[model samples]
Target chain A: TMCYSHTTTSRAILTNCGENSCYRKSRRHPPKMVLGRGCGCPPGDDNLEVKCCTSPDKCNY
Target chain B: TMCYSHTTTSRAILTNCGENSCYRKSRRHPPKMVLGRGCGCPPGDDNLEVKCCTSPDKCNY
Candidate 1:
């Protein structure tokens, strides 16, 4: 699958995850930035956001 | 590259990354868990470990 991949300091780039899923992670620091889309996710709490999917960039972003 | 990817509850799964990198990330709950190998990493602080590389699973583990 392909998704929007980016970081706090980078721009969104269309990324390919092959058979893996897409993810949008955010680290909570009074702000939540949709980190990127990748195969899967690590973890998250009130400290951050971990949202995964099989859709494309727009869907994940 | 390949990397030992696991979490606090899941077993180590040999993961293969294409153009991406391998990573071993952990939250500082007084313990670190090698999350997995993927394209990239999210973020971490003294709260956790964010170790990324272009090596194999053994290197990350």
Candidate 2:
């Protein structure tokens, strides 16, 4: 299985999914950039697993 | 005229153009993420203009 992570200093929220993933920057006075990654799995796959990493350094498959 | 500027903390180079624009994350030891936008001009259109902004807030048309 493939794994991914989103890292950002501010609130650049990662919206959409899979082929549709896009970043939406915050409209607040100070930008709160946020980032993250989503799985490639199809809908309703209970066997899927994900491990969150505080930093990209720890995001190993 | 339309303008766009790339803003990213790392080297996430904005490659391609227009409808083809996409973010290419760096594969170096430390990932460098970069972001940018491209114009919708057709080939050989000298009339197009762009104004860059250090932050998206400044990237007003």
Candidate 3:
């Protein structure tokens, strides 16, 4: 799968995840996480809302 | 600041980061991370790339 990757400071980039899944996550302030639109569902904070997909390329954008 | 949050499973969402910074991260497969576009910069994998900023709203999109 392909995912969107960028930072608040950089332009977006396209990434290929191969066998891994694509995902996106949102976190709250005073304690959270993004700049992420890439691979896997790593263990994270309960405050962080995450989404993962095993669809075709670019599914994470 | 505002950030982009989504999953390969769901559509994108705009989130407020309040006092935290906006960020975007991309990780490699078989050893990485995302699905995140929200607040703060918690620690993570070395193989994972990260970007963070304190810019205005939508800075993390």
Candidate 4:
């Protein structure tokens, strides 16, 4: 029931600025800036629900 | 790096009718309209990250 809202520029394309911001803000402080390296989990992981703490670094458990 | 880039449309969306309006330029400060019971967070724990606000209404933790 918890609902979150994000604003997108293009309605035609659904970009996840909110999701990205969430991950970025939830980083390990001094945010890393790199492609494929900074981005943690894949979009919409059911496991990301509550059980797991999202690792900023893309490491396999 | 603090990044906050939102367009007029985005502002309109986040602030007002960004989601419903398909057109680029939409009305703002418009009088209230008919809506259903707004969405809120669920009681207990779900670990659900409310995509919009990081508040108690939708606790992420």
Candidate 5:
């Protein structure tokens, strides 16, 4: 369960959550968050819907 | 004549000079700099030998 954040050249905010978190800028609109039951992101953290692993066991951590 | 610099995950320094300077990491040893008469990098700046355009005109900026 890890969380990462950064701002792109376009000034849009980026956030990632997963076992091994990392991120890159997107020319398109800010990406939507993907969330799930696993991934260990606390319940409220996944509101953005960023992709999360199905279980903590599968997380990169 | 733009200059950009950053550190990669490997803790190696990366730098670029040109119109639209940008850089990425390499898995191997830190990349060697390539310099020449054309690139906008000042004479002393090219010591690392990073690639530089033949002339400022060829730079990304």
Candidate 6:
């Protein structure tokens, strides 16, 4: 299906899956890799877990 | 006993006894509070605050 269009699948690290054929079954949940101070999880959740103390906290969202 | 100042207890609002116990009475010298754009508290002492805007509009830290 068009699950790729709905999920952040492109960023997904698939090994042997073919093209977009990495559908629901082949599509795997990426590891919980946290980068930077607070880049993973939802925006609000990240804030509570790790406060990002930076100069320019402005975001496009 | 010397209460464990190791406790962020200094950051806690307490009113009681003391002893290497993490128990807090009151911080004899608590860390200074902060003053940021979104922080819901009065600006620094004597009202030395800031107005975050483009063009490098800032105040003394």
Which of the numbered candidates is closest to the native, going by highest TM-score?
1
Candidate 1 regions exceeding 4 Å error are B1-61
Interface RMSD of 3: 9.2
Evaluated with lDDT, which candidate comes out highest? 3
Candidate 2 vs 4: which has more TM-score: 2
Residue B2 of model 6 has an lDDT of: 21
Write the residue-wise lDDT of candidate 1 on B4-32 in tens digits: 66543343456666667777665444222
lDDT string for model 3 (B1-61, tens) is 7777654234457778788887766554422335455678755464556578788677755
* Model 3 alpha-carbon drift over 4 Å, by segment: A28-35, B1-61
CAPRI accuracy category, model 2: incorrect
> What is the DockQ for all candidates, taken in turn?
0.02, 0.02, 0.06, 0.02, 0.02, 0.01
Instruction: Tell me each candidate's RMSD, in Å, in order.
Output: 14.5, 15.2, 10.4, 17.5, 12.9, 18.9
Native contact fraction of candidate 3? 0.00
Assess the local accuracy of residue A8 in candidate 2 as a C-alpha lDDT between 0 and 100.
33
| Best-matching candidate per DockQ | 3
Q: Count clashes in each candidate, considering only residues at least 3 apart in sequence or on different chains.
A: 4, 16, 13, 3, 17, 0
True contacts kept of each: 0.00, 0.00, 0.00, 0.00, 0.00, 0.00
Q: Residue A51 CA error for candidate 4 (Å)?
A: 18
Clashing pairs for model 1 are B2-B57, B3-B57, B5-B36, B28-B47
As a whole number from 0 to 100, the lDDT of residue B54 in candidate 2 is 34
Q: After superposition, how far is residue A2 of candidate 1 from its true place, in Å?
A: 1.0
lDDT of each: 0.57, 0.29, 0.61, 0.21, 0.28, 0.21
**How many angstroms is residue A57 displaced in model 3 relative to the true structure, after the best TM-score fit?**
2.1
lDDT of 3 at A32: 36
DockQ of 6: 0.01
Using TM-score as the yardstick, the better of models 5 and 6 is 5
User: Following a full C-alpha superposition, what root-mean-square deviation does model 3 have from the true structure?
Assistant: 10.4
- Candidate 5 local lDDT, A1-61, one digit each (tens): 3333322111122234444433221111122212112223332221233343433332421
How much is the lDDT of residue B15 in candidate 2? 31
lDDT of 4 by residue, A1-61 (tens): 1112222111121233323322211111121111111222344331122112233322211
